A paper describes a structure:
KIF4A is a chromosome-binding kinesin that is important for maintaining normal chromosome architecture during cell division. The KIF4A LxxIxE motif peptide (CSPIEEEAH), like that of Emi2, was previously shown to bind B56 weakly (KD, 32 μM). In order to test this, the KIF4A sequence was mutated to the stronger LxxIxE motif by mutating 1224CS1225 to LE (KIF4ALE; the structures of B56γ:LxxIxE complexes show that the ‘L, Leu’ binds the deep hydrophobic pocket on B56γ while the ‘E, Glu’ mimics a phosphorylated Ser, which forms multiple salt bridges with B56γ residues H187, R188 [these residues are conserved in all B56 isoforms]). The affinity of KIF4A1192-1232,LE for B56γ increased 50-fold compared to WT KIF4A (KD of 0.32 μM). Mutating KIF4ALE residues 1231AH1232 to PE further enhanced KIF4A binding (KD of 0.10 µM). Mutating the KIF4ALE,PE basic patch (1208KKK1210 to AAA) again reduced the binding affinity by ~2 fold (KD of 0.22 µM), a reduction similar to that observed for WT KIF4A. Specifically, KIF4A residues 1207 to 1232, which includes the basic patch and the LxxIxE motif, were broadened beyond detection upon binding B56γ. A crystal structure of the KIF4A1192-1232,LEPE:B56γ complex showed that while the LxxIxE motif is well-ordered, electron density corresponding to a single conformation of the basic patch bound to B56 was, as expected, not observed. That is, the basic charged patch of KIF4A binds B56γ but does so via dynamic, rapidly interchanging conformations even when bound to B56.
The PP2A holoenzyme is a heterotrimer, composed of a scaffolding subunit A (PPP2R1), a regulatory subunit B (PPP2R2-PPP2R5) and a catalytic subunit C (PPP2C). Thus, it is the highly variable B subunits that determine PP2A holoenzyme substrate specificity. Proteins containing validated LxxIxE motifs bind B56, an all α-helical heat repeat protein, in a deep, highly conserved hydrophobic pocket. Here we describe a novel dynamic, charge-charge interaction for a major protein phosphatase, PP2A-B56, which significantly contributes to our understanding of the diversity of mechanisms used by this phosphatase to select its substrates. This novel interaction is mediated by a patch of basic residues that dynamically bind a highly conserved acidic surface present on all B56 isoforms and therefore constitutes a novel pan PP2A-B56 binding motif.
Numbering used by the authors:
A (entry chain A): 37 to 109, 128 to 377
B (entry chain B): 1221 to 1232
The structure:
């Protein structure tokens, strides 16, 4: 019976071992366990209807025993990478039924998985990123708990200085959610964009998670072009008043906001924008000015400028125009 | 960084 041997090899991978007086049995045990994982990865990726009901607790148990650990202030990445892979192909499988898995993938599991985002291994955080994205898309009953617990991590990172190596990869997930949001946006989300996503531009380690943060900010305005006024005004607030090469990030974000800005809302914030933008063209840092002047290579911006030339050119070149 | 495909929010 094949279903029995599947469970045997699963439980076999729940035995964590160590040999200090036998460096060869250790290697075999590793190789025996690395091989059993590979065998199961192939078995589940290519065979149809092999995922039966008794399997689910075995898989979640095998994942929890290997992955849910304590992160040192990993080394056996060959093994850890196979586990995430197997668990990933297990979620993606067409034989996967969330109604049965909902029993064993509870909130405690999701919580424990989020602890691992603090890990300092980019390749591990990349597997955790993908894994959490499959859970959200199939476990409707966990979508709320995840948002609440992610909204917690961010709140801890801005205010309580709870540094997190996983901020970048968490934002990347949120963008996948924001892009699929529903008709009127809930106030729960608006608050998050305003009272969480924008204050993220305030933290010092912005250099690491800025591209993904900007994506979420743009995806929010792509849905509801109502929030483009408080977004832009906040960015000019959080704008580094100190002339620094970190302005290039804001110019990037602002040009990315302008490529999707609704012209009816552009005029609502076009004056305070260019006052700052003119300051950038006058910056003592070439990279800042070079970037602000690269705005003109944007055709949709030029149209927005010429259709409002009466207000812009006075600000950009006050020597040459008046009001 | 993109990569991940969107998730159509629908009634929980």
């Amino acid at each position: 019976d094949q279903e029995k041997l599947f469970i045997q090899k699963l439980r076999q991978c729940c035995v964590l071992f160590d040999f200090v007086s036998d460096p060869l049995s250790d290697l075999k045990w590793k190789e025996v366990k690395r091989a059993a994982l590979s065998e199961m990865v192939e078995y589940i990726t290519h065979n149809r209807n092999v995922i039966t009901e008794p399997i689910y607790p075995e898989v979640v148990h095998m994942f929890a025993v290997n992955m849910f650990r304590t992160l040192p202030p990993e080394a056996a990445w060959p093994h850890l990478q196979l586990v995430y892979e197997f668990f990933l192909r297990f979620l993606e499988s067409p034989d996967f039924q969330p109604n049965i898995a909902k029993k064993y993938i509870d909130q405690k599991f999701v919580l424990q998985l989020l602890e691992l985002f603090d890990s300092e291994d980019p390749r591990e955080r990349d597997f955790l990123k993908t894994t959490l994205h499959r859970i959200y898309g199939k476990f409707l009953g966990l979508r709320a708990y995840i948002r609440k617990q992610i909204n917690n991590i961010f709140y801890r990172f801005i205010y309580e200085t709870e540094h997190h190596n996983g901020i970048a990869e968490l934002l990347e997930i949120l963008g996948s959610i924001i892009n699929g949001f529903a008709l009127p946006l809930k106030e729960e989300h608006k608050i998050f964009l305003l009272k969480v996503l924008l204050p993220l531009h305030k933290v010092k380690s912005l250099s690491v998670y800025h591209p993904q943060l900007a994506y979420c900010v743009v995806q929010f305005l792509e849905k509801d072009s109502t929030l483009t006024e408080p977004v832009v005004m906040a960015l000019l607030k959080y704008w580094p008043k100190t002339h620094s090469p970190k302005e290039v990030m804001f110019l990037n974000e602002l040009e990315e906001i302008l490529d999707v800005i609704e012209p009816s809302e552009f005029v609502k914030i076009m004056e305070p924008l260019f006052r700052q933008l003119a300051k950038c063209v006058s910056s003592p840092h070439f990279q800042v000015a070079e970037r602000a002047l690269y705005y003109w290579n944007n055709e949709y911006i030029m149209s927005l400028i010429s259709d409002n030339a009466a207000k812009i050119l006075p600000i950009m070149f006050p020597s040459l125009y008046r009001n | 960084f993109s990569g991940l495909e969107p998730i159509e929010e629908e009634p929980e």
